[PDB]
């Protein structure tokens, strides 16, 4: 057996510290507590890590999600036992539904006390079983490195997701006395069937006359995904449409872009999909919000399949989701980016699809998706605020990241903003957690310090977690908080004075009541150095 | 006909739910809207038969419900939507579970036909809340709705009270009851025994009643005694008769008037030193509605010397707790209060060497003008000011040093007046619990003695207080200068700590939320601000800059 002694003499806390470094972790979100003290002190006292403190553990969890989605790295959360652990359940469930990599470490009462109704003792492993890909309770310090490495491996492989590691106080406070297996300290057949599927899929794409790329979140789980997607779209001249969670993976300013697909997407995108002979699904799960009545989804693709000249190709990483909603002609199992890479050289270069694009461009100017404009001297419409802010943001030339709350403003943000860069739309889709906006924006800002981070929030959503406003100031994250306030069966909620709230929290507050002041405020909003909140009184829902 | 009930035929799940709440004597519901719970939400929200309290975050709803229950004696009813709505009430359920607080949580769920398909906002709530509820279930059909509701309330309020969860699929609550259902399933499972039951209990009651009289004793009373209306009343009678010293756990505070000369006050490590000794200088420890927390007896082995010989009576309700931590001599299973009445007769009226011994031990155990303000002084002065109003006063707190100071330096007199998170110790509990308590006792003066870090956890509920019209008095003992994490300290006792959270301007926050804000920086302004604080009509927040070296 290959043994290692480099950790002998250290405490669980220092080992934890060392393991984070080996995992390339430089940011940790969390809140202190007695049970997690040994680890907290180690991380909090090291200048090797940036410890971000929220005002509520839920904040830590959502901040970690924002961090992960904007960086591509797993979000690390550190909290204490009992209430500390239960306060991160929503964020774990949220991350679980959206497939976001997150590693949650929770302090626990001493192993000797487990199952005695000790103070702040909770069956966290049991509580988080359904909202984590995997969880475990470290039983001894020798086991610590192993569990950490497993946690990171699982959280970042297959469909990314959250994992939880329960850390008993006696275990993290103990000192490693014995050497441990070297393997456990270092990070991390059908191979033929998959290669066959890649060939078959290449054959279908080369064969297609009116193909469509239906792209989702999966393409963002690899740094080169968006690049290879563009390459494939250019090489075979294939129009590209994305899901809500796929926004940003393809430049919407590109001529081949169909924009968002679904009951809330562009008519043109929905048409291309209903008329296509081949649909190439890349990192998307065919949600009914996208497909509509499944039995009537992609009729021309079905016909092609029936006649042996098309159908549906699905690049999926999870075997469980293959053929789950729709029967597919071909399924390429595994990482979408990797497989698109292996398939590129097999794709026949297509000079043009004049007819297909003619029909598409015809629908574009035939169904110009536009909301109901605003009548002079009247309540400001939210879609307008978004279309405009998008322009103002764009004029700065900076990299822009957008987070949102949950509600009507969420869909408007998705629809009326012009997406161009990957990892720039961070919204809660799977679970739809109100209050996500602010903390996710803070975490995204910590991940991309130079980026302009905007949170397009709703008034009710914003109230859920507005206490994190002071956390933004403390963390030095200059997030731009936009609140589309449409508050005048019918649950009228009382809102605080958002501007006075902001000032009370330590930020600059701005308000807009009339159309004649919107443009100036939007510019000041985006131009302000430091965190700032802008409330725009908008027309009732 | 008592066989089938037809009164609900034709109604929707939502109206049935509405009717069931009435049969359960529910007039208050805390919750937040969402698509999955819409059918029920609309029914409750549109009825003037119920007061629907809206928080800004579901966690607020849960803690508000706990405060409501502890101050009223009734179960706290919570109504939330699926997914995030359900997961946001997990902490409050875990909190209520640890402190044995009756709470009925109703969560909207995706249609039964969609269960297990990863539908939008679908969560295995029954699985998530299994370890933090006494019982839970997912209603499968509208005919089953009345049954589950009655079971939920029965379980939440019997044995050791606790939280229960009822998962409500949208299609089920939106459906209309077409067929009749058995009357048994629609009648509340409210609350007779046999000679076999009466004898078994009476047996242990007498055996215990003997070991009592035949001894010279101490009452170790806890939260259990407050779970019966006439609980504390019989506690006094049993202390008067045989002249017995009464000591309470943190959760027992208020069960016995600390004015009476027989009060040993609070027990445990952060308790009055006198009590800890009296618990040793006692020949017989009469445990009443307590669970011997290790925080009450660290040296489990060195616990109760004089009582460890001539035979530790235990009036417990859950057999699963008897002889599961400490070792008892006699066990009087069942409701404490009830078993006390069933033992009042067998008690021989009356001790002088007992008091003298204590009074001495007790008689054996401030700030200078110009220096920092001490928390203890704030609490003692506030207790006095509160008392001078003559009103019924209820106190809630956050979690931390201020929690223990509130317990120690306040003078407890009335039952159901100290509402603090002891079992789970949930920071952020103060404000929402105070709002719920206020809704339960509209005429009571409700004070939340909070800490700055704890208060930040849930300060968004401030606007909820204004909206609900609850005139809660929020006291924030801000000691932000000392960190909330100790690195090291002094033996003989300074504290060096780290991790300081940046607090917002509490006064400007209050004003922004719609309340009156007050601040105290110097000792020379404390008394006036305390009086204004308590005298202000409407919700008000008072921040007192306190010494970080206390
Ligand atoms: C009222 C309402 C309206 C909505 N309208 C729309 C709409 O019009 N259009 C729209 O798009 N959405 C809409 N949504 C959102 C929608 O419900 C789904 O949440 C979302 O579209 C799912 O997107 P996704 O498939 O890209 O991501 P996910 O649900 O995260 O699924 C990603 C898929 O990719 C797979 N995957 C992950 N990583 C990899 C990898 N490395 N390699 C290969 N595969 C991988 C996953 O296993 C999974 O199958 C709406 C929601 C609501 C509440
Ligand atoms: C920093 C800190 C310091 C603390 N210091 C102290 C301290 O010094 N002293 C202290 O006491 N606590 C202290 N606590 C609180 C402590 O952790 C426990 O939560 C508390 O002592 C439990 O009190 P209890 O047993 O009275 O109530 P519970 O924990 O609620 O237990 C009640 C018991 O009574 C039973 N019961 C319930 N209803 C009935 C009924 N109707 N009839 C009969 N039996 C019934 C229950 O089943 C249970 O066994 C502290 C907490 C913190 C965070
Ligand atoms: C934690 C949580 N509670 C409840 C819901 C149900 N819900 C979905 S959208 C919505 C209202 C959103 O209001 P607001 O944030 O103001 O946005 P708007 O739709 O007005 O833009 C609610 C209550 C939810 N998604 N999450
Ligand atoms: C939700 C939650 N997170 C963390 C803890 C750990 N914790 C216990 S006391 C405390 C600090 C309390 O600070 P404050 O509220 O300001 O009170 P003080 O002790 O200063 O009076 C913390 C962080 C907890 N009990 N609950
Ligand atoms: O300080 P805690 O984590 O023991 O409450
Ligand atoms: O309104 P929701 O709960 O369906 O998002
Ligand atoms: O309080 P500190 O340790 O974060 O500076
Ligand atoms: K767009
Ligand atoms: K006292
Ligand atoms: Mg709104
Ligand atoms: Mg404090």
Curated annotation (Swiss-Prot), chain A:
What are the entry keywords? Amino-acid biosynthesis, Branched-chain amino acid biosynthesis, Magnesium, Metal-binding, Mitochondrion, Thiamine pyrophosphate, Transferase, Transit peptide
Q: Which reaction does it catalyse?
A: 2 pyruvate + H(+) = (2S)-2-acetolactate + CO2; 2-oxobutanoate + pyruvate + H(+) = (S)-2-ethyl-2-hydroxy-3-oxobutanoate + CO2
Ligand binding (Mg(2+)):
459, 486, 488
**In which compartments does the protein localize?**
Mitochondrion
Q: How is activity modulated by pH?
A: Optimum pH is 7-7.5.
| EC number(s) stated in the UniProt entry for this protein | 2.2.1.6
Q: Which GO terms describe its biological process?
A: branched-chain amino acid biosynthetic process; isoleucine biosynthetic process; L-valine biosynthetic process
Give the binding site residues for FAD: 159, 264-285, 316-335
Q: EC class of this enzyme?
A: transferase
Which Gene Ontology molecular-function terms are recorded?
Answer: acetolactate synthase activity; flavin adenine dinucleotide binding; magnesium ion binding; thiamine pyrophosphate binding
Subunit structure of this entry?
Answer: Homodimer. The acetolactate synthase complex contains the catalytic subunit ILV2 and the regulatory small subunit ILV6.
Describe the family membership recorded for this protein in Swiss-Prot or TrEMBL. Belongs to the TPP enzyme family.
Role according to the record: Catalytic subunit of mitochondrial acetolactate synthase, which catalyzes the first of a series of common steps in the biosynthesis of the branched-chain amino acids. Catalyzes the irreversible decarboxylation of pyruvate to a bound hydroxyethyl group that then condenses with either a second pyruvate molecule to form 2-acetolactate (AL) or with 2-ketobutyrate to form 2-aceto-2-hydroxybutyrate (AHB). The first product is the precursor for valine and leucine biosynthesis, while the second leads to isoleucine.
Anything further noted? Contains 1 molecule of FAD per monomer. The role of this cofactor is not clear considering that the reaction does not involve redox chemistry.
Protein's name according to its UniProt entry: Acetolactate synthase catalytic subunit, mitochondrial
Species name? Saccharomyces cerevisiae (strain ATCC 204508 / S288c) (Baker's yeast)
Please give the range of the full-length protein represented by this chain.
83 to 648 of 687
């Amino acid at each position: 057996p290959d043994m290692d002694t480099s950790f002998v003499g250290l405490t669980g806390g220092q080992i934890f510290n060392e393991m984070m470094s080996r995992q390339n972790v430089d940011t940790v979100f969390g809140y202190p507590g007695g049970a997690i003290l040994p680890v907290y002190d180690a991380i909090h006292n090291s200048d090797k890590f940036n410890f971000v403190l929220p005002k509520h553990e839920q904040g830590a969890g959502h901040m970690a999600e924002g961090y992960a989605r904007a960086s591509g790295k797993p979000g690390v959360v550190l909290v204490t036992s009992g209430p500390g652990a239960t306060n991160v359940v929503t964020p774990m469930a949220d991350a679980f539904a959206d497939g976001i990599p997150m590693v949650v470490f929770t302090g626990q009462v001493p192993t000797s006390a487990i199952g005695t109704d000790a103070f702040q003792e909770a069956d966290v492993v049991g509580i988080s079983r359904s909202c984590t890909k995997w969880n475990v309770m470290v039983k001894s310090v020798e086991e610590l490195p192993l569990r950490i490495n497993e946690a990171f491996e699982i959280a970042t492989s297959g469909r990314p997701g959250p994992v939880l590691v329960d850390l008993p106080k006696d275990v993290t406070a103990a000192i490693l006395r014995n050497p441990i297996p070297t393997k456990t300290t270092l990070p991390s057949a059908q191979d033929e069937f998959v290669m066959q599927s890649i060939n078959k899929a290449a054959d279908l794409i080369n064969l297609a006359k009116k193909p469509v790329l239906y792209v989702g979140a999966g393409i963002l789980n690899h740094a080169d995904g968006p690049r290879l997607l563009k390459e494939l779209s250019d090489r075979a001249q294939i129009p590209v449409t994305t899901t809500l969670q796929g926004l940003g993976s393809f430049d919407q300013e590109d001529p081949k872009s169909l924009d968002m697909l679904g009951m809330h997407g562009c008519a043109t995108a929905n048409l291309a999909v209903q008329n296509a002979d081949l649909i190439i699904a890349v990192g998307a799960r065919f949600d009914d919000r996208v497909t509509g009545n499944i039995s009537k989804f992609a009729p021309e693709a079905r016909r092609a399949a029936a006649e042996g000249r098309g159908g549906i190709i699905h690049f999926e990483v999870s075997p469980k989701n293959i053929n789950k909603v729709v029967q597919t002609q071909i399924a390429v199992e595994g990482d979408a980016t990797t497989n698109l890479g292996k398939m590129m050289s097999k794709i026949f270069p297509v000079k043009e699809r004049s007819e297909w694009f003619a029909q598409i461009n015809k629908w574009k100017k035939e169904y110009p998706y536009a909301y109901m404009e605003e009548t002079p001297g009247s309540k400001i419409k939210p879609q307008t605020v978004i279309k405009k802010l998008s322009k103002v943001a764009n004029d700065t030339g900076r990299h822009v990241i957008v987070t949102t709350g949950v509600g009507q403003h969420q869909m408007w943000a998705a629809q009326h903003w012009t997406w161009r860069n990957p990892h720039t739309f961070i919204t809660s889709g799977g679970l739809g957690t109100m209050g996500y906006g602010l903390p996710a924006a803070i975490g995204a800002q910590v991940a991309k310090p130079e980026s302009l981070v905007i949170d397009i929030d709703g008034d009710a959503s914003f109230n859920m977690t507005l206490t994190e406003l002071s956390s933004a100031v403390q963390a030095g994250t200059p997030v731009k908080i936009l609140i589309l306030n449409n508050e005048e069966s019918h649950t009228h909620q009382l809102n605080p004075d958002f501007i006075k709230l902001a000032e009370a929290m330590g930020l600059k507050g701005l308000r807009v009541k009339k159309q004649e002041e919107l443009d100036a405020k939007l510019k000041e909003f985006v131009s302000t150095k430091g965190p700032v909140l802008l409330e725009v009184e908008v027309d009732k829902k």
